[PDB]
């Protein structure tokens, strides 16, 4: 339930 | 003006 | 450089 | 599992 949070920022730099 | 949005996911897994 | 991080959660519940 | 995401914006303006 945190990926959405850790990823939401990842997609911004991937 | 974005690191905050990106790092915000870093502190979540550091 | 933060409103983005404030109104973002807003639209999600407005 | 989103409140944390929605609220995280709340404490930022309360």
Swiss-Prot record, chains A, B, C, D:
It is found in: Endoplasmic reticulum membrane; Endoplasmic reticulum-Golgi intermediate compartment membrane; Golgi apparatus membrane; Golgi apparatus, cis-Golgi network membrane. A motif (COPII vesicle coat-binding) lies at residues 6-7. Cargo receptor involved in protein vesicular trafficking and quality control in the endoplasmic reticulum (ER) and Golgi. The p24 protein family is a group of transmembrane proteins that bind coat protein complex I/COPI and coat protein complex II/COPII involved in vesicular trafficking between the membranes. Acts at the lumenal side for incorporation of secretory cargo molecules into transport vesicles and involved in vesicle coat formation at the cytoplasmic side. Predominantly dimeric and to a lesser extent monomeric in the ER. Monomer and dimer in ERGIC and cis-Golgi network. Forms homooligomer (via GOLD domain); the assembly is promoted by direct binding with leaderless cargos and may form a protein channel that facilitates cargo entry into the ERGIC. Forms heterooligomeric complexes with other members of the p24 family such as TMED2, TMED7 and TMED9. Ectopic expression of TMED10 alone does not result in its proper cis-Golgi network localization. Interaction of TMED10 with TMED2 is both necessary and sufficient for transport of the couple to the cis-Golgi network, and TMED3 and/or TMED9 contribute to facilitating the process. Belongs to the EMP24/GP25L family. This is Transmembrane emp24 domain-containing protein 10. The gene is TMED10. The chain holds residues 207 to 219 of 219 of the full protein.
């Amino acid at each position: 339930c945190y990926l959405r949070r850790f990823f939401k920022a990842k997609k911004l730099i991937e």
